[PDB]
Write a protein that binds this ligand. Structure first.
Ligand SMILES: *[C@@H]1O[C@H](CO)[C@@H](O[C@@H]2O[C@H](CO)[C@@H](O[C@@H]3O[C@H](CO[C@H]4O[C@H](CO)[C@@H](O)[C@H](O[C@H]5O[C@H](CO)[C@@H](O)[C@H](O)[C@@H]5O)[C@@H]4O)[C@@H](O)[C@H](O[C@H]4O[C@H](CO)[C@@H](O)[C@H](O)[C@@H]4O[C@H]4O[C@H](CO)[C@@H](O)[C@H](O)[C@@H]4O[C@H]4O[C@H](CO)[C@@H](O)[C@H](O)[C@@H]4O)[C@@H]3O)[C@H](O)[C@H]2NC(C)=O)[C@H](O)[C@H]1NC(C)=O
Ligand SMILES: *[C@@H]1O[C@H](CO)[C@@H](O[C@@H]2O[C@H](CO)[C@@H](O[C@@H]3O[C@H](CO[C@H]4O[C@H](CO)[C@@H](O)[C@H](O)[C@@H]4O)[C@@H](O)[C@H](O[C@H]4O[C@H](CO)[C@@H](O)[C@H](O)[C@@H]4O[C@H]4O[C@H](CO)[C@@H](O)[C@H](O)[C@@H]4O)[C@@H]3O)[C@H](O)[C@H]2NC(C)=O)[C@H](O)[C@H]1NC(C)=O
Ligand SMILES: *[C@@H]1O[C@H](CO)[C@@H](O[C@@H]2O[C@H](CO)[C@@H](O[C@@H]3O[C@H](CO[C@H]4O[C@H](CO)[C@@H](O)[C@H](O)[C@@H]4O)[C@@H](O)[C@H](O[C@H]4O[C@H](CO)[C@@H](O)[C@H](O)[C@@H]4O)[C@@H]3O)[C@H](O)[C@H]2NC(C)=O)[C@H](O)[C@H]1NC(C)=O
Ligand SMILES: *[C@@H]1O[C@H](CO)[C@@H](O[C@@H]2O[C@H](CO)[C@@H](O)[C@H](O)[C@H]2NC(C)=O)[C@H](O)[C@H]1NC(C)=O
Ligand SMILES: *[C@@H]1O[C@H](CO)[C@@H](O)[C@H](O)[C@H]1NC(C)=O
Ligand SMILES: *[C@@H]1O[C@H](CO)[C@@H](O)[C@H](O)[C@H]1NC(C)=O
Lengths: 51, 102, 51
């Protein structure tokens, strides 16, 4: 997960904190890098039915 | 709540197509039926003498139903203290049925 | 109608139903909240379209 405050070139954006909240999912986003196992996944930035 | 409609090409790729949405509230006004019963004015079914699955006055289970006749004054449902049907009386008449686990 | 509106012990409730809002009882014993205390009772009342 990447928050590009650096895009401003002059990080006034350091006064803003933008991050993922605990979700509605049976897993934490940040822990998906542990040895978690799936049949299939797929990720989206837009609304998906059932997701 | 809903039921997603999914598509695949020989179970390699998977994608969502759409969904069926349903609302509801609990109660006893509407009953689902296994098939489009016709002709019949009032729907029921009773099979005797070998294993069946039954739904009888909301008791649900399996076993064998047999007819009998005893002077069972009182209501129409007879159960064990474990909540299982022992028998029932057929409402409109005095015939009684015995329910056993095959 | 008895004193305090009780229905006499021994009465047969020929057409008196228990009211419900959903399911019904078939056989058993329980405490209910039911419109069973009488303030009046009017036999063969003579109700007509002119009443
Ligand atoms: C709350 O509501 C209840 C729910 O309905 C109520 O319990 C019910 O009470 C009635 C009383 O009105 C029960 O009466 C039954 O009547 C049988 C019918 O015959 C009589 O009535 C006819 C109509 O009134 C008459 O025509 C007939 O009289 C004629 O014939 C006689 C015989 O030829 C003669 O002497 C008369 O002159 C006349 O000519 C007659 O009067 C009756 O057979 C029935 O059987 C019981 O008694 C037999 C004798 O003791 C036993 O052999 C049978 O084996 C019965 O006992 C069982 O039930 C008792 C009650 O449940 C238990 O104590 C016993 O332990 C035994 O229970 C076992 O068997 C059950 C299976 O059969 C099983 O489920 C149990 O687990 C256990 O295994 C009886 O008198 C009526 O059946 C009761 N109904 C029910 C469903 O229980 C209760 O009273 C109400 N509460 C209150 C506070 O009142
Ligand atoms: C299916 O589900 C519905 C779901 O709501 C349910 O209906 C509701 O039933 C209860 C019972 O039928 C009704 O609520 C109130 O019940 C009291 C009952 O009397 C007892 O309590 C008083 C107070 O504790 C005791 O003094 C008495 O001895 C009893 O023990 C009624 O007295 C209430 O009536 C009021 O309204 C009348 C009309 O507005 C007035 O004339 C009466 O003065 C009451 O005024 C009181 O209540 C007002 C409430 O807004 C309040 O502003 C007043 O100051 C005052 O205190 C009353 O009706 C409840 O209303 C019912 N539901 C609906 C839709 O009305 C059904 O019973 C259920 N059916 C079945 C079969 O289960
Ligand atoms: C509780 O107890 C009631 C007690 O009456 C039972 O309800 C009755 O069920 C019978 C079945 O149990 C209904 O009577 C007739 O059933 C025929 C059923 O088909 C079978 O039996 C015929 C018997 O000759 C066989 O040829 C056939 O293969 C089947 O095996 C119907 O076809 C009858 O219809 C005819 O008569 C009616 C009435 O005169 C006409 O309207 C029709 O046109 C037609 O000519 C018929 O209905 C009997 O009607 C039912 N009782 C009541 C009150 O309606 C309940 O079944 C029982 N409870 C349970 C769960 O079984
Ligand atoms: C505050 O000023 C700095 C200048 O004082 C702003 O950052 C510069 O903005 C100009 C044009 O608006 C860009 O050319 C510069 O290259 C910027 N700086 C850097 C390091 O890239 C800064 O945005 C101002 N910050 C505010 C108002 O939040
Ligand atoms: C058993 O069930 C079949 C249907 O499952 C029926 O043909 C047969 O008559 C039954 N009865 C007995 C006692 O064998
Ligand atoms: C009725 O009860 C007798 C009681 O002795 C039994 O022999 C008979 O099979 C019963 N069943 C029916 C349906 O008549």
């Amino acid at each position: 997960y990447i928050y590009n405050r650096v895009k401003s070139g002059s990080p006034g954006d350091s006064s803003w904190h933008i991050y993922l909240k605990s979700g509605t999912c049976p897993f934490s986003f940040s822990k998906l890098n542990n040895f978690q196992k799936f049949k299939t996944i797929c990720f989206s930035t837009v609304e998906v039915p059932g997701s | 709540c809903n039921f997603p409609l999914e598509a695949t090409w020989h179970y390699t790729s998977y994608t969502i197509v759409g969904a069926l949405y349903v609302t509801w509230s609990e109660g006893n006004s509407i009953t689902g039926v296994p098939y489009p019963v016709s002709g019949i004015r009032e729907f029921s079914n009773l099979v005797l003498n070998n294993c069946t699955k039954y739904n009888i006055y909301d008791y649900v289970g399996t076993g064998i139903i047999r007819s009998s006749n005893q002077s069972l004054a009182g209501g129409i449902t007879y159960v064990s203290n474990s909540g299982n049907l022992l028998g029932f009386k057929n409402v409109s008449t005095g015939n009684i049925f015995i329910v056993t686990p095959c | 109608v008895q004193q305090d509106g009780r229905i006499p012990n021994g009465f047969p409730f020929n057409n008196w139903f228990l009211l419900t809002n959903g399911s019904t009882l078939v056989d058993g014993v329980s405490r209910l909240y039911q419109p069973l205390r009488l303030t009046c009772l009017w036999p063969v009342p003579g109700l007509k379209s002119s009443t």
